[PDB]
Amino acid sequence: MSSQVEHPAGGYKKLFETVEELSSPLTAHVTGRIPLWLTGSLLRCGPGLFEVGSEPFYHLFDGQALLHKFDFKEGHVTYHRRFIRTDAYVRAMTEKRIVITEFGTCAFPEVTDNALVNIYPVGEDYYACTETNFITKVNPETLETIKQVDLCNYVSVNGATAHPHIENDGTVYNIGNCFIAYNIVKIPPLQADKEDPISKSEIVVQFPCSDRFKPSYVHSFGLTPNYIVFVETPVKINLFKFLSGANYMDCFESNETMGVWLHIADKKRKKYINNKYRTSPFNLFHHINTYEDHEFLIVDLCCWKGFEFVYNYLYLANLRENWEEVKKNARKAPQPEVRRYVLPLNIDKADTGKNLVTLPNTTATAILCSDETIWLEPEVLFSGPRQAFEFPQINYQKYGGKPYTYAYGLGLNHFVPDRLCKLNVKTKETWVWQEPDSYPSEPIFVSHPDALEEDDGVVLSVVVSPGAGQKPAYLLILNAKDLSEVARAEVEINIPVTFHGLFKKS
Ligand X SMILES: CCCCCCCCCCCCCCCC(=O)O
The residue ranges that bind ligand X (CB under 6 A) are 60, 117, 162, 285, 310, 314, 390, 412, 415, 417, 441, 497, 499-500
Task: Report whether 76 belongs to an annotated binding site.
Answer: no
434 binds Na ion (CB under 5 A): yes
- For position 212 contacting a second copy by CB under 8 A, the verdict is no
**DSSP-assigned beta bridge partners for residue 157:** none
The answer to whether the beta carbons of residues 382 and 411 sit under 8 Å apart is no
Under DSSP, the state recorded for 315 is B
Transcribe 21-57 into DSSP letters.
--SSPEEEEEEE---TT--EEEEEEEEEE-EETTEEP
Tell me the C-alpha distance between 443 and 452, whole Å: 21
The span of 127-135, 180-188, 422-430, 444-452 binding ligand 8E4 (CB under 6 A) equals: 127-135
State whether residue 110 is helix, strand or coil.
coil
**Beta-carbon count within 10 A of 135 CB:** 27
d(CA 362, CA 291) in angstroms, rounded, equals 14
Task: Tell me how far, at minimum, the Cβ of 499 lies from ligand 8E4, in Å.
Answer: 7
Q: How many residues bind a second copy (CB under 8 A)?
A: 40
Query: Is 80 a known ligand-binding residue?
Result: no
Say how many Å lie between the first and final Cα of the chain, rounded.
33
Assess 275 for contact with a second copy (CB under 8 A): no
* Bridge pairing between strands 282-292 and 296-305: antiparallel
Query: Is residue 427 within the footprint of a second copy (CB under 8 A)?
Result: no
- Is residue 256 at the binding interface for a second copy, with CB under 8 A as the rule? yes
Task: Please tell me the distance from the alpha carbon of residue 48 to that of residue 59, in angstroms, as a whole number.
Answer: 13
- Tell me the residue type at 61: F
- Interaction of residue 226 with a second copy, rule CB under 8 A: no
Three-state DSSP class for 171?
A: coil
Q: Nearest distance from residue 408's CB to ligand 8E4, in Å?
A: 20
Is 294 one of the annotated binding-site residues? Answer: no
Find which of a second copy, ligand 8E4, Na ion, none residue 24 binds, CB within 5 to 8 Å per kind.
Answer: none
| Three-point CA angle 447, 453, 455, nearest 5° | 55
300 Cα distance to chain centroid: 14
434 touches which of Na ion, a second copy, ligand X, none (CB within 5 to 8 A by kind)? Na ion
Interaction of residue 156 with ligand 8E4, rule CB under 6 A: no
Contact range with ligand 8E4 by CB under 6 A, out of 64-72, 125-133, 165-173, 205-213: 125-133
Nearer to ligand X, 374 or 464 (CB): 464
Residue 500 annotated as part of some ligand binding site: yes
Q: How far apart are CA 367 and CA 387, in angstroms?
A: 30
- Residues tagged in the binding site annotation for Fe cation: 163, 219, 286, 500
Query: Could you list the residues that contact ligand 8E4 (CB under 6 A)?
Result: 61, 103, 112, 117, 130-132, 158-159, 162, 177, 237, 242, 248, 251
Residues that bind a second copy (CB under 8 A): 254, 256, 279-281, 305-308, 331-337, 351, 353-358, 360-365, 367, 369-371, 375, 377, 379-380, 383-385
